[PDB]
Copies of this chain bind each other. A is one copy, B any other.
Amino acid sequence: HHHATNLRGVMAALLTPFDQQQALDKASLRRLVQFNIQQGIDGLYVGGSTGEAFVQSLSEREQVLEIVAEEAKGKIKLIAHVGCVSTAESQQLAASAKRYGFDAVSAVTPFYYPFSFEEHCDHYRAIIDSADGLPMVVFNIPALSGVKLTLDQINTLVTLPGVGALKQTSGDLYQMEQIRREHPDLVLYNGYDNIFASGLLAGADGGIGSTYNIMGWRYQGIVKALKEGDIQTAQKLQTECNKVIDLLIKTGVFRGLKTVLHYMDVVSVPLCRKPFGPVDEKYLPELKALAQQLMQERG
């Protein structure tokens, strides 16, 4: 796990902007990439859950990977989420990620159909081979995937040849500590933004998160505060993050984030893809106020 240590840090789970006809909005994607770099983010996690991967075609997901690499390769770290239910499809996205010069690939535990643990392990093996050298970030998100891995099973996955990190989207901070205890050198990303400070204390050494797109500097502020033993500042920043998260949960998180970014002059049209609907108009005053607040706070 030592080789992949340059993957440690705070990485935004990049949103995929759409135009009014729900096609990819390439100009807004480019601006959002640049907006994240200018915030001082360590990297981008592209085509993930937050990226609305599972309502895009492989072709569209590739177009997005290619554009992000064009804008950001060499400036920040780049992780391509290549995960599909199909292994073969995941491998195609892995090969493309390699071609575009990504630093690493990532795959959600394949979902919908129940698979045996061995079948999961072979899935990751195959994607790792297609990534042809790019390390794998295993992506565990039980609340959405329906896949319920034991600690022993997680231990096996994260020690597969070519695995360099775990994106742990789980609120179980006992397990977060257990994972850190077993794997002292493992890059371990906290996946739920609303427990970030507590996840770091448990053992996570960074994070990948949707809300980083609009306030990534706060999460970097929590990392700094904890490393300096400034517990009060860490808690205060986490409380501010959670105030925002409360609102985003009310509005719908991806579309709420897109709407803030629209008022921040980044995203032209803040729609998610159907069957996601639009933000309820009653929330616009609150979201506008948040965009104003954050713009004044700055990166």
Residues of chain A having any CB pair with chain B under 8 Å? 22, 49, 54-58, 85-89, 110-116, 118-120, 122-123, 126, 144-146, 171-174, 177-178, 181, 192, 194-195, 197-199, 201-203, 226-231, 234-235, 238-239, 242-243, 245-246, 273-277
Question: Top 3 A-B pairs ranked by shortest CB distance?
Answer: A229-B229, A87-B274, A198-B198
Contact A172 B171 (CB under 8 A): yes
Collect the chain B residues with CB atoms within 8 Å of residue A195's CB. 173-174, 177, 198, 202
Given contacts A112-B111, A276-B119, are A197 and B192 in contact (CB under 8 A)?
A: no
- Give the residue name and chain of the B residue nearest to A170 (CB): B171
Given known A-B contacts A85-B55, A174-B171, A242-B174, A116 and B277 have beta carbons under 8 A apart: yes
Residue of B88, B226, B231, B273 near A22 (CB, 8 A) is B88
Q: How far is the CB of A108 from chain B (nearest CB, A)?
A: 9
User: B198–A173 contact, CB under 8 A?
Assistant: yes
**7 A-B pairs in the complex with CB atoms less than 8 angstroms apart:** A86-B274, A86-B275, A118-B277, A173-B173, A195-B202, A198-B199, A228-B229
Pair B277/A119 contact, Cβ less than 8 Å:
yes
Q: Is the CB of B201 within 8 A of A174?
A: no
Give bound CA distance, A227 to B230, whole Å. 10
Residues of B within 8 A of A231 (CB): 201, 226-227, 229, 231
Find the B residue at minimum CB distance from A141: B112
Q: How far is the CA of A115 from the CA of B272 in the complex (A)?
A: 12
* Closest chain B residue to A181, Cβ basis: B239
This chain: copies in complex: 4
> What's the nearest-Cβ distance from chain B to residue A83, in Å?
11
Contacts of A201 in B (CB 8 A): 197-198, 201, 231, 234-235, 238
Q: Which of A144, A198, A226 has the most CB of B within 10 A?
A: A198
Q: Which residues of B contact A118 (CB under 8 A)?
A: 277
The answer on a CB contact under 8 Å between B202 and A174 is: no
- Chain B residues with Cβ below 8 Å from A227 are 231
Contact A86 B55 (CB under 8 A): yes
**Chain B residue contacts of A58, Cβ below 8 A:** 57
Q: Which residue of B lies closest to A239 (CB)?
A: B181
Q: Least Cβ distance of A138 to chain B in Å?
A: 14
Chain B residues near A110 (CB, 8 Å)? 275
Known A-B contacts A88-B273, A113-B276, A274-B88; A198 and B202 likewise in contact (beta carbons under 8 Å): yes
How many angstroms from the CA of A231 to the CA of B195 in the assembled complex? 17
Instruction: Please state if A113 and B194 are interface contacts (CB–CB under 8 Å).
Output: no
Asked whether, in the complex, the Cβ of B275 is within 8 Å of the Cβ of A122, the reply is yes
Among B126, B171, B202, B275, contact of A274 (Cβ-Cβ < 8 Å): B126
Q: Is B55's CB under 8 angstroms from A275's CB?
A: no
